[PDB]
Structure to design on (928 residues):
């Protein structure tokens, strides 16, 4: 059973983990280093010597799509397509796969509680210069509602506001926030138990962020990715279960009515969002391993680690789209487009006008892409994931005014300030397919194809040529 | 069980009328059937066609009731249940092979059949209710389609399948996988109604239309091997034509009047050479026509839309009703009503009509309304259009979209624009005005008037 430490040793053996021994500040400097690293497609990072703390900081764990795949046991990212097909079928009895509860776990080797709780001992990162305060970013928040047994895991960012106080920033449609809201109605004035796990095994972490139904525990999906049940431990101060292999766990409660102004914080759009009120999470216990490692990240101008996660998890929808639109060869939402705002789609074109049907499908078929404001459509000779191919197609196959579709007064994310009116805006589709008779009266260009015999001969003599050494 | 059982059922219910007067298959049957259909009358069996001994059955499905009856059900509302069955097609019923007695060889003469000429400037007599059966070279599946077939000789028909049909794809692959070899084909006339309706229901290309008919019927489709090939045709068929398409052989087809109410201009299609004609002893010739709507095809199309509503609703649960009026040539305009949930919602729905199913890919007008509108009443739809739209703000135009190649109104063959009219009530964001509160009647006043209405005796 691979915990997180086993995963890190695997990565280190493969040149995918780098240890930094230089002093580095969790205030601002780690983010800067991780940002450069991720943008150059480099390794995961373990800062062994964080200025002013003894606990090492792990970040950029999933900064590469390969490492997302490795964290699910696989060679490559496509295994997620099979999960795509599985999730289709539920709308499979032994996907009622519970947790295996241990008695005793490394995450409860060192325990501290009540007045001894000091979150200031943890190297919590401050990501961006005008962020309100240090922020916990890779916590798996565990909750139960009052009406079912199911344990939801979510990643909700948590601002530091005291020795033993965090803000719990869950948006109102999240599992945690619904559970809390129901608890308040069903047990007026009673404290809401909550626990947060930092540094679980990778299948658990990836499972937390997969969009499974609210009906199902995210612990059960991680078991499917792993092939074995998720190993958990009961919390000390409540009946919630956290991953046995966790590096750190926070236990406590939300006092009903207690709230704090949250942020501003920089976020995945690359802007600061403005201040707003959220529940306060009071921390009564902190449990941890001997030698505990603090797992963290940051969100900002894309691409960041969340964006890269989002790209690997979209692979889930390609199969669902392809069932409906078999002409679709690939479907990609680049991280640099805030993960959902631009899509590039490649097709086997079969008739004049085909690109327009495809655009309308992206905008109508699934809800996850309802709010996608740019769609670029290309032929299957284009790698959707390489701007060198996509820009080539755009610049050699479009006449801008003929081949651009604009539609107005369409649904747009209320927080997208770039639209003229909250909730309402336009969308653009770019038809960059080759134009067929009817679409153009010109003689279209024949692309340059290489001689496969020449290519093969050069492969053979390439090492002997020794141009680099 | 077979077609004759269905005709006796219809006759018992006053839905089949026998004509004993002499009536010409050249032009006159079409005229009679057209009046009958437009007044919602019965199916017609012409027992004495001028110059032939074989009776002509037409307007079989000229009423939506009769389409429902032909699927075993009482009512047109039952068609939605058939739609939910058709939905069940996610991921991870064969034929019963056993009649027709008399058979011909080189005494093949299609002139002995009362093939109809529909409209005065049609090129020639035209076979219009043939179930064309084909196999491709790559799978076992037998596709059934309805393709019109011009008479060009004693033993020659033109096979007018458009290129996206199962038959035309099967042929195209056969040529290429077996260069220069004759393509076996068989056409069944007058099969049982479940088989006929199964043929025209758009099931997947993966699936045989024989299997679906079995679900509508409740029992396996009973079939028989053809005499001259390995294709299987319905055992209860009244007439069967067997033969082949000679690769490369084509003929100019038409002009023929079409479901749009205009003539298609002349065009080339494969020739079907007929080597055998099999039939029942008292064979009945099943035929129809297309023209200005409404016609039998249009009525078929209206009943089959009821099948699709559930499929659309599964995808788009905000859709309350979805209707394609016959007067729009059955597919060219759709009216959709929704329970609107957010600003801009109508646009998502328009794009769904235009992208989700292929039957509506070519639909050039879409009108979207709220659920207080009956989609099927132009009084409601025009009301919504004229009280909830600002034309320029609320009209969506999209250019260079796929369009039916025969639609002469588009600027270029195969390519044209589409219009969506958002006639929903406008929510904050979509308008800065105070929207109008509609007049709702007092249900207590309405009830009181229902009670005293007869006593009032106004009529
Ligand atoms: C991976 C990840 C996902 C974040 C996230 C982060 C990361 C690293 C942070 C912590 C770096 C900063 C932005 N985070 C938030 C967030 N959702 C949310 O409501 N508030 C957030 O602050 N998301 C998304 C959210 O956790 C996922 O959508 C979960 O699948 C929600 O699970 P649920 O649907 O069961 O509630
Ligand atoms: C009911 C009906 C449907 C006709 C039709 C007719 C009728 C009476 C005629 C004979 C009166 C006039 C025009 N017909 C043609 C036709 N499709 C086609 O490609 N060529 C045609 O000539 N259609 C539609 C077609 O037969 C159905 O949509 C099938 O579902 C197509 O089969 P497939 O999906 O298996 O390809
Ligand atoms: Mn959950
Ligand atoms: Mn078919
Ligand atoms: Na989740
Ligand atoms: Na068909």
């Amino acid at each position: 059973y691979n915990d997180l430490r086993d995963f890190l040793t695997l990565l280190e053996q493969q040149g995918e983990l780098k240890r930094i021994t230089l002093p580095v500040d969790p205030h601002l400097e780690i983010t800067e280093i991780a940002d450069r690293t991720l943008r150059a497609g480099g390794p995961a990072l373990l800062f062994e010597n964080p200025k002013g703390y003894s606990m090492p900081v792990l970040c950029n764990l999933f900064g590469t799509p390969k490492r997302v795949a490795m964290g699910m046991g696989q060679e490559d990212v496509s295994a997620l397509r099979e999960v795509g097909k599985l999730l289709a079928f539920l709308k499979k009895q032994v996907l009622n796969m519970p947790t295996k509860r241990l008695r005793g776990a490394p995450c409860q080797q060192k325990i501290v509680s009540g007045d001894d709780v000091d979150l200031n001992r943890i190297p919590i990162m401050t990501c961006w210069p005008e962020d309100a305060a240090p922020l916990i970013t890779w916590g798996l928040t565990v909750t139960r509602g009052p009406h079912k047994e199911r344990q939801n895991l979510g990643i909700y960012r948590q601002q530091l506001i005291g020795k033993n106080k965090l803000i719990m920033r869950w948006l109102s449609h999240r599992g945690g926030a619904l559970d809390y809201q129901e608890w308040c109605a069903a047990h007026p004035g009673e404290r809401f138990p909550v626990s947060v796990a930092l540094g679980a095994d990778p299948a658990t972490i990836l499972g937390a962020v997969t969009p499974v139904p609210d009906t199902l525990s995210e612990y059960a999906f991680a078991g499917l990715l792993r092939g074995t049940k998720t190993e958990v431990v009961k919390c000390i101060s409540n009946d919630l279960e956290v991953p046995a292999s966790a590096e750190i766990v926070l236990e406590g409660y939300i006092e009903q009515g207690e709230t704090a102004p949250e942020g501003p914080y920089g976020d995945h759009t690359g802007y600061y969002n403005e201040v707003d009120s959220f529940p306060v999470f009071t921390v009564t216990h902190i449990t941890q391993r001997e030698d505990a490692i603090y797992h963290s990240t940051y969100t900002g101008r894309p691409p960041d680690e969340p964006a890269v996660l989002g790209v690997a998890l979209n692979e889930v929808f390609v199969p669902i789209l392809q069932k409906q639109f078999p002409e679709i060869v690939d479907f990609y939402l680049p991280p640099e487009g805030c993960s959902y705002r631009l899509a590039v789609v490649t097709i086997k074109k079969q008739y004049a006008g085909h690109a327009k049907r495809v655009m309308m499908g992206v905008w109508s078929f699934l809800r996850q892409f309802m709010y996608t404001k740019f769609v670029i459509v290309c032929d299957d000779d284009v790698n959707a994931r390489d701007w060198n191919d996509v820009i080539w197609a755009i610049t050699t196959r479009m006449d801008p005014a003929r081949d651009t579709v604009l539609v107005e007064n369409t649904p747009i994310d209320y927080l997208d300030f770039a639209s003229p009116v909250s909730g309402l805006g336009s969308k653009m589709g770019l038809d960059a397919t080759n134009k067929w008779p009817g679409e153009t009266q010109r003689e279209w260009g024949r692309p340059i194809k290489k001689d496969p015999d020449v290519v093969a001969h050069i492969d053979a003599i390439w090492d002997e040529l020794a141009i680099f050494n």
The pocket of sodium ion (ligand 6) is lined by residues B 144-145, 199, 202, 209 (CB under 6 Å). The interface with chain B takes residues 85, 88-89, 323-324, 351-354, 356-358, 360-361, 363-365, 370, 402-403, 405, 407-412, 421-424, 431, 438-439 of chain A (CB under 8 Å).
